[PDB]
Design a protein around this nucleic acid. Structure first.
Ligand code: MG
Ligand code: MG
Ligand code: MG
Ligand code: MG
Ligand code: MG
Ligand code: MG
Ligand code: MG
Ligand code: MG
Ligand code: MG
Ligand code: MG
Ligand code: MG
Ligand code: MG
Ligand code: MG
Ligand code: MG
Ligand code: MG
Ligand code: MG
Ligand code: MG
Ligand code: MG
Ligand code: MG
Ligand code: MG
Ligand code: MG
Ligand code: MG
Ligand code: MG
Ligand code: MG
Ligand code: MG
Ligand code: MG
Ligand code: MG
Ligand code: MG
Ligand code: MG
Ligand code: ZN
Lengths: 115, 102, 152, 108, 304
RNA sequence: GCUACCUAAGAACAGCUAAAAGAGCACACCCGUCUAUGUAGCAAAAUAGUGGGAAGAUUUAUAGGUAGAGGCGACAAACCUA
RNA sequence: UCUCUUACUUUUAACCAGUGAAAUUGACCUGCCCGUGAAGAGGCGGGCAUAACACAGCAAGACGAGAAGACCCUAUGGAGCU
RNA sequence: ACCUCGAUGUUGGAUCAGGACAUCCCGAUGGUGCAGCCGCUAUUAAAGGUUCGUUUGUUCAACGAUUAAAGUCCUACGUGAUCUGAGUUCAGACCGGAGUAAUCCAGGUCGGUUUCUAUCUACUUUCAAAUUCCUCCCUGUACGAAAGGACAAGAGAAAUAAGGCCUACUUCACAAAGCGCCUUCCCCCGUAAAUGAUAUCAUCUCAACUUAGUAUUAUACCCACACCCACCCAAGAACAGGGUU
């Protein structure tokens, strides 16, 4: 569960995510009617003094049984149009995204590992 | 690799050309598909450079040549962990004794 | 809500509850018959039977010894448990204690109960007894029982 | 929050003479067959129990006398014998408690 | 003076009486196993608009159930225990819209029942039952009293409504009873943490009827609508119903067909009056499954 | 005999760091920052926690002095038997 | 702290036994809606409602209760200060 | 026919909201300078809903991110014997100004005590009817020169609300809980049209009339009553209730 003002780990090849900064990227907003964000939920970050859209790919909070649980809250940066900012995802990505409603094909394509 | 049977990447001349190709294949799919077969969604319509359609056994990527070059999806799927862009990525390291320096 | 809560809240808290029950149990092992408030007696009863079971488990057993050492504050009672109480009940598999309600306490009008270990040396309690078989109702039913067994 | 008005004796009588407030008659009361004093069913007869408790106390006084001081619990079974009684085969190897009085009828 | 059954009985008479009454109950139950062999009420074919009798079941508990698509559904187990038709009332006699069947479930002690109830059951020739519930039926669905009811009355794929008394939470405040937000912990808030705020408005010198205030919650009848029957176990008379039913485990629930308009006329394939085992046409297996249910003993499912 | 100030002759201040002090941490002791409790209360000002000081312009026992147009005051119109 | 609250223990609580106050009180056989009364009604008018009695909660009303206020004005009423 | 600044149980917030319609969204219509998508305007509709944050400048003002929408009001600030900022508003203190001073400000800033054990009225599971968004199909259709881009009908996913539950997960452990799971059913009336007189045409009719029109929704739930020793309980403050074969 990712809410407003949740510190977040960017799992991406993108320069914006990986570049050193004094503060960790923080969730500005969750694009869901309830504030709570899960896997496949688009969020808005404060990263490097700019507002940027991101997609959640795993989190610490437990979910359904067979679904994986990650030790860190993991996001992938996306532009307003919907394409990913970064080229590659090294961190393993759950396969539950495929069936979920939304634009997940781009992210799965650039992903290398699935858990 | 638990994604698809076939991964297809194609190039288009223009955004309009990408749209034309993506819509035609989906229209042809709907005609030929079984009733039990689920409907497909064209993804990245608003994007001017990248379109992708996911079927049951196939994934189609429709992208502009300059977009294709930087992403090099061909290299990634042929070489899963041996990709050039993966090599430049270095895993994060926690400092020893859990004390930062400088 | 207290659905499926099996232990009473007594004393100054959980530890105090254990200590109160321990004292009642020590009293019971020594005296073989104890008057106390009904609820406290009812709470202690379970522990009384469990203690006999650990007594049966053996003198040599270290686990049983540790339990006996805890529950019996007076140490002279620990031999008694292993050598007197446990051999007494070797035949039966349970029902070591007998609990009966007693007329309310004078001072505070508390519901009271007597608890004893069965087969004690002490004078027998005025236990409630079911009606004699020779009563009119019992005679009629004995007639019925006879008729049924004759039918078969 | 204070009463705005004095409650009358009429209203007060209605409150305090309500069946809910009244003492309920008990139907548990029966004659104890042993002594003839009244006992509540489900409860041991007070008189009979007092009798048993008096005897128990006397025996316990004797137990304490024989033991001598604290922490002297025997490692053998106990038996109580009154006047004109001798230990049996079963009573042999048991602690003997002597009483100066005769056997009670109820004690068996 | 107050009296119970075994008050005046001897030491040896108590076990005898217990045995005698238990055996009579067993005999009476066993007597009613063949309703069709006895003179039945006429059996009519199912018609649109017709409503059949339901059952009274005991809530055993819950277990998971899986489907071929891979989705997990939790189910509640309802055991049908000594469920008999007790009474029939005509529409004119009931002074109501429909004919009624009184149906009882879960046999109980004769010693703990009132004389009136005991007399009624004596006339029936059945041991007394814990709960009796009334089912509104059409005339063509009438069943002779004394007829046993079984879990196979319901069939997988059918939707049912379940009614029971909810778990009683006793006296509860507004936060647990009505989900009131309460007041903050710190920043003052002297004695206001869980209190109801403003109960009413200033202008009205009163409190509206039916305002949400602290009181007794639970221990009231509620109905769960549109629960799917996933599985029947004919041997133990178990109904597997989708999701959760009201009440604690080992309580008695009223099970009838769904009243929801979607499932109005889906009673075509169901046994109309009831299921009669003594009929013995196509003897049902131990377990009846829905098509989607992953049966135990089936091979591991692959999503092809 | 409270309290403000003074006079006479007294008493108290563990432990640790300190070139060594109206120094620091920190007991006892003195005070009363903030919160909660209490509000006909344990109490006509308290309790629990948290705090400020704790070798000194320190704290404190005893006896004496200053008296209302007045005393006394590191001025708060403070205190001078609720 | 909060999203968003939950579980347990102690106190309190409620019940049983003993002892046993206080503020308060014109009398009360002490309902609801609309209206009236320059606002404002348990009690007045027009409708409606209505066997009677406890116990436990609640705080919308009884301009709810106790002092102590703050504001404005008045007294050929005081006092402190300049 | 002078410059003021007033008022001050005055007004925020929490909790719970009751109501109005003069409707912000969701429903149904008429007109359009309505090709379609968006709109503008009016009629009808109060069943349901109406976000989370932050102030660099702004005289009842904004900014960021959302949303189907982030309505306008009445209720003694609706509501302080449920709670809490600020202001009136002060006992201490300072700054600017005034005053010989004491002191003042209609100016600014810091610090600062309202308690209540409920007598009466009223009330304490009315219940059994849920809304909305998004995605897909239609369909990339109708429409349109293109750009763009529907409505009905259907399917799937959610969020909230109401009512339950504990198989798993999580807080935990004979159990209670959510962060978990399950269920959720009817319509609304403004107009659009036939036939047809007063007024032999015509005319939807405060003419007789005919359809959309649905009307009173309905169905669900509850429903037998020992002893009222005692014991137990998934029932419960007491009482009551269920079980004791
Ligand atoms: Mg209990
Ligand atoms: Mg206690
Ligand atoms: Mg809270
Ligand atoms: Mg508090
Ligand atoms: Mg206070
Ligand atoms: Mg001196
Ligand atoms: Mg020192
Ligand atoms: Mg110092
Ligand atoms: Mg210091
Ligand atoms: Mg001084
Ligand atoms: Mg001064
Ligand atoms: Mg002054
Ligand atoms: Mg004085
Ligand atoms: Mg009380
Ligand atoms: Mg009392
Ligand atoms: Mg008095
Ligand atoms: Mg009025
Ligand atoms: Mg009147
Ligand atoms: Mg009351
Ligand atoms: Mg009055
Ligand atoms: Mg004068
Ligand atoms: Mg004068
Ligand atoms: Mg005015
Ligand atoms: Mg409202
Ligand atoms: Mg209107
Ligand atoms: Mg207002
Ligand atoms: Mg108020
Ligand atoms: Mg301060
Ligand atoms: Mg009963
Ligand atoms: Zn007797």
């Amino acid at each position: 569960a990712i809410q407003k003002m949740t510190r977040v780990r960017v799992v991406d090849n993108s320069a914006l995510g990986n570049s050193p900064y004094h503060r960790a990227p923080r969730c500005i907003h969750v694009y869901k009617k309830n504030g709570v964000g899960k896997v496949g939920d688009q969020i808005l970050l404060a990263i490097k003094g700019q507002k940027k859209k991101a997609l959640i790919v795993g989190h610490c909070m437990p979910g359904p049984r067979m679904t994986p649980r990650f030790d860190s809250n993991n996001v992938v940066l996306i532009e307003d149009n919907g394409n990913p900012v970064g080229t590659r995802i090294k961190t393993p990505i759950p396969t539950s995204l495929r069936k979920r409603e939304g634009e997940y094909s781009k992210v799965l394509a650039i992903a290398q590992n699935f858990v | 690799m638990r994604y698809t049977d076939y991964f297809v990447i194609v190039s288009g001349t223009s955004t309009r050309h990408l749209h034309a190709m993506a819509f035609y294949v989906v229209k042809m799919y709907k005609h030929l598909k079984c009733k039990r077969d689920p409907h497909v969604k064209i993804e990245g319509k608003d994007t001017d450079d990248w379109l992708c359609v996911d079927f049951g056994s196939m994934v189609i990527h429709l992208m502009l040549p300059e977009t294709r070059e930087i992403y090099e999806l061909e290299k990634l799927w042929t070489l899963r962990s041996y990709d050039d862009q993966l090599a430049q990525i270095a895993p994060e390291t926690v400092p020893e004794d859990f004390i930062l320096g400088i | 809500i207290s659905h499926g809560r099996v232990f009473r809240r007594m004393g100054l808290g959980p530890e105090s509850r254990i200590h109160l029950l321990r004292n009642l149990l020590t009293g019971l092992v020594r005296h073989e018959r104890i008057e106390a408030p009904w609820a406290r007696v009812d709470e202690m009863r379970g522990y009384a039977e469990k203690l006999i079971d650990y007594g049966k488990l053996g003198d040599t057993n270290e686990r049983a010894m540790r339990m006996a050492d805890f529950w019996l504050t007076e140490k002279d009672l620990i031999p008694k448990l292993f050598q007197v109480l446990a051999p007494r009940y070797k035949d039966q598999t349970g029902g070591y204690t007998r609990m009966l309600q007693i007329p309310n306490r004078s001072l505070d009008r508390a519901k009271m109960a007597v608890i004893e270990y069965k087969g004690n040396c002490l004078p027998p309690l005025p236990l409630p007894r079911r009606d004699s078989h020779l009563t009119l109702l019992n005679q009629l039913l004995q007639g019925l029982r006879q008729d049924l067994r004759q039918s078969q | 929050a204070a009463p705005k008005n004095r409650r009358t004796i009429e209203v007060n009588r209605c409150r305090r003479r309500n069946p809910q407030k009244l003492i309920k008659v008990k139907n548990n009361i029966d004659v104890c067959p042993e002594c003839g004093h009244l006992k509540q069913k489900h409860v041991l007869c007070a008189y009979c129990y007092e009798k048993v408790c008096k005897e128990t106390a006397e025996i316990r006084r004797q137990i304490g006398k024989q033991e001598g001081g604290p922490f002297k619990a025997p490692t053998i079974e106990t038996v109580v014998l009154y006047t004109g009684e001798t230990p049996s085969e079963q009573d042999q190897g048991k602690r003997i408690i002597e009483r100066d009085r005769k056997r009670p009828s109820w004690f068996t | 003076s107050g009296t119970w059954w075994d008050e005046h009985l001897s030491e040896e008479n108590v076990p005898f009486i217990k045995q005698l009454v238990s055996d009579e109950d067993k005999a009476q139950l066993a007597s009613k196993l063949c309703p069709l062999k006895d003179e039945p009420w006429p059996i009519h074919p199912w018609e649109p608009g017709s409503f059949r009798v339901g059952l009274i079941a005991l809530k055993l508990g819950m277990m998971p159930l899986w489907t071929k698509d891979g989705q997990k559904h939790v189910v509640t187990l309802l055991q049908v225990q000594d469920c008999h038709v007790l009474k029939y009332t005509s529409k004119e006699n009931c002074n109501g819209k429909m004919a009624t069947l009184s149906v009882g479930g879960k046999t109980v002690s004769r010693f703990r029942k009132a004389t009136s109830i005991l007399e009624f059951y004596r006339e029936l020739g059945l041991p007394p039952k814990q709960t009796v519930k009334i089912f509104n039926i059409t005339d063509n669905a009438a069943i002779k009293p004394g007829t046993p009811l079984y879990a196979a009355h319901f069939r997988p794929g059918q939707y049912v409504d379940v009614t029971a008394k909810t778990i009683g939470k006793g006296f509860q405040g507004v936060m647990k009873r009505w989900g009131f937000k309460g007041q903050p912990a710190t920043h003052g808030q002297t004695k206001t943490h869980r209190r109801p705020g403003a109960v009413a408005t200033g202008d009205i010198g009163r409190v509206w009827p039916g305002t949400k205030m602290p009181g007794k919650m639970g221990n009231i009848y509620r109905t769960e609508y549109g629960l799917k029957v996933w599985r029947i176990n004919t041997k133990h008379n178990i109904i597997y119903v989708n999701g959760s039913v009201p009440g604690h485990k080992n309580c008695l629930v009223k099970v009838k067909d769904s009243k929801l308009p979607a499932y109005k006329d889906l009673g075509k394939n169901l046994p109309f009056p009831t299921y009669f085992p003594d009929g013995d046409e196509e003897e049902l297996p131990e377990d009846l499954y829905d098509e989607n249910v992953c049966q135990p003993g089936a091979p591991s499912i692959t999503f092809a």
